[PDB]
Scaffold this active site. Structure first.
Site, PDB file in Angstrom:
ATOM      1  N   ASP A 268       0.822  -1.196   0.000  1.00 31.96           N
ATOM      2  CA  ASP A 268       0.000   0.000   0.000  1.00 31.96           C
ATOM      3  C   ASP A 268       0.866   1.260   0.000  1.00 31.96           C
ATOM      4  O   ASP A 268       0.635   2.237  -0.708  1.00 31.96           O
ATOM      5  CB  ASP A 268      -0.918   0.005   1.224  1.00 31.96           C
ATOM      6  CG  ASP A 268      -0.182  -0.138   2.540  1.00 31.96           C
ATOM      7  OD1 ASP A 268       0.920  -0.730   2.586  1.00 31.96           O
ATOM      8  OD2 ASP A 268      -0.718   0.357   3.558  1.00 31.96           O
TER       9      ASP A 268
ATOM     10  N   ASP B 177       7.328   3.098   3.306  1.00 32.42           N
ATOM     11  CA  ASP B 177       7.588   4.225   4.191  1.00 32.42           C
ATOM     12  C   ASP B 177       8.970   4.171   4.827  1.00 32.42           C
ATOM     13  O   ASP B 177       9.910   4.788   4.320  1.00 32.42           O
ATOM     14  CB  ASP B 177       6.510   4.263   5.286  1.00 32.42           C
ATOM     15  CG  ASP B 177       6.479   5.621   5.961  1.00 32.42           C
ATOM     16  OD1 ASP B 177       7.549   6.270   6.006  1.00 32.42           O
ATOM     17  OD2 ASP B 177       5.391   6.023   6.428  1.00 32.42           O
ATOM     18  N   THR B 178       9.086   3.445   5.937  1.00 30.39           N
ATOM     19  CA  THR B 178      10.371   3.167   6.554  1.00 30.39           C
ATOM     20  C   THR B 178      11.009   1.963   5.848  1.00 30.39           C
ATOM     21  O   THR B 178      12.227   1.808   5.889  1.00 30.39           O
ATOM     22  CB  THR B 178      10.324   2.838   8.053  1.00 30.39           C
ATOM     23  OG1 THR B 178       9.963   1.455   8.225  1.00 30.39           O
ATOM     24  CG2 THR B 178       9.298   3.705   8.762  1.00 30.39           C
TER      25      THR B 178
ATOM     26  N   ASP C  23      -5.063   2.821   6.583  1.00 32.75           N
ATOM     27  CA  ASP C  23      -5.868   3.057   7.772  1.00 32.75           C
ATOM     28  C   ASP C  23      -5.168   3.890   8.836  1.00 32.75           C
ATOM     29  O   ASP C  23      -3.950   4.030   8.850  1.00 32.75           O
ATOM     30  CB  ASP C  23      -6.264   1.702   8.384  1.00 32.75           C
ATOM     31  CG  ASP C  23      -5.238   1.197   9.379  1.00 32.75           C
ATOM     32  OD1 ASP C  23      -4.449   0.286   9.042  1.00 32.75           O
ATOM     33  OD2 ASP C  23      -5.214   1.712  10.519  1.00 32.75           O
TER      34      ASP C  23
END
Ligand SMILES: O=c1[nH]cnc2c1ncn2[C@@H]1O[C@H](COP(=O)(O)O)[C@@H](O)[C@H]1O
Ligand SMILES: O=c1[nH]cnc2c1ncn2[C@@H]1O[C@H](COP(=O)(O)O)[C@@H](O)[C@H]1O
Lengths: 184, 187
Positions: free
Chosen positions: B109, B112-113, B168
């Site tokens: 999705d 990020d990290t 979410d």
């Protein structure tokens, strides 16, 4: 659209999209007096992998349209291989399924979760072969009724194939024979 | 556009996502034109990383069908372990089939990290697949904790907390049609 392995098309994705919007409209009203809210008391969609993945992504979207607070759960069977992450005890649950045939499956799911005490347990199915129950079961929500035939696409599969189809179609008879034996 | 009181600014609408996914799907189609992908025998295996990729996936796989790309759909569920800094997550659900000698595509999705995504990758690299690549709806380039580049990127973004279309906040707002920025006054 037309396909090579389809004996005939069943439900075009346009008609499908329509039947879903509608059902979510019924669902929306049915829980109106239920005090559903994000976080605390949302509608828990327990979706069953992997055949309702398509249905679930589109239908959950149908529900935001009717402004329906929802919680996504994914479980798997083949045996219980993946159970719910969080509790449904004191919640309204919606077992999202792809197709009810013999119903042997949904009946099992229903009671299991029925013994889990949620504030209420209802079921939506995309497709329903009413003429083939090996055992009694009635879906609360039903997008479309289909005769006893093998259909693929819209998440639905033959040997984990044809799932990504945008449409519900009928697997050509001389195609599953044609492979089922290459298998078994 | 729709209203989202709990949202300060919509980043992307369903249609923008649509246009970007379709675009990404053709790119996947040319890149695999020659690997002779076929159903049953040697499909494009989609490894959907639950719960967040569920919406991306349902849409992604259809765009690809449009490009005649036979895809095998696999779904995995994972759980944090803590204990972990290598990206270690617990496997709650594994793939139905092996990816050995297979063209595999992890489906996240948002990178990020990248610890989890980087961890799954390594996990699946050791399963000797024909080829191993990743597609990610969203990507926050700076935010790495580990060096990680995705093979396909639907769209880039800054370090906002985003939500919608699968993504979410505390199990909330994934059901949304567009991708929006949760407004500061909610965390
Ligand atoms: O025509 C079909 N197409 C795809 N899957 C089917 C079909 N009929 C039954 N199934 C699968 O059978 C599972 C069990 O059906 P049931 O237990 O008889 O209601 C469903 O969740 C489907 O994934
Ligand atoms: O901007 C964001 N909004 C919502 N969830 C996010 C966001 N970034 C990361 N996550 C969640 O945290 C996971 C961690 O991604 P990572 O930081 O790259 O390891 C994602 O797959 C999401 O489930």
């Amino acid at each position: 659209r037309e396909y090579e392995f389809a004996e005939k098309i069943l439900f075009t994705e346009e008609e499908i999209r329509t039947r879903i919007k509608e059902v979510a409209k019924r669902i929306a009203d049915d829980y109106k007096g239920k005090g559903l809210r994000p976080y605390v008391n949302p509608l828990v969609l327990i979706s069953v992998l992997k055949g309702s993945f398509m249905f679930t992504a589109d239908l959950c979207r149908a529900l935001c349209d009717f402004n329906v607070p929802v919680r996504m759960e994914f479980i798997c069977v083949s045996r219980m291989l993946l159970d719910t992450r969080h509790s449904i005890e004191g919640h309204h649950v919606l077992i999202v399924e792809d197709i009810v045939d013999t119903a042997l499956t949904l009946n099992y799911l229903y009671h299991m979760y029925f013994t889990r005490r949620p504030a209420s347990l209802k079921t939506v199915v995309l497709l329903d072969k009413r003429e083939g129950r090996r055992v009694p079961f009635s879906a609360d929500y039903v997008v479309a009724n289909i005769p006893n035939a093998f259909v693929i696409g819209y998440g639905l599969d033959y040997d984990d194939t044809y799932r990504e189809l945008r449409d519900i179609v009928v697997l050509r008879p001389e195609v599953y024979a044609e492979r089922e034996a290459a298998r078994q």
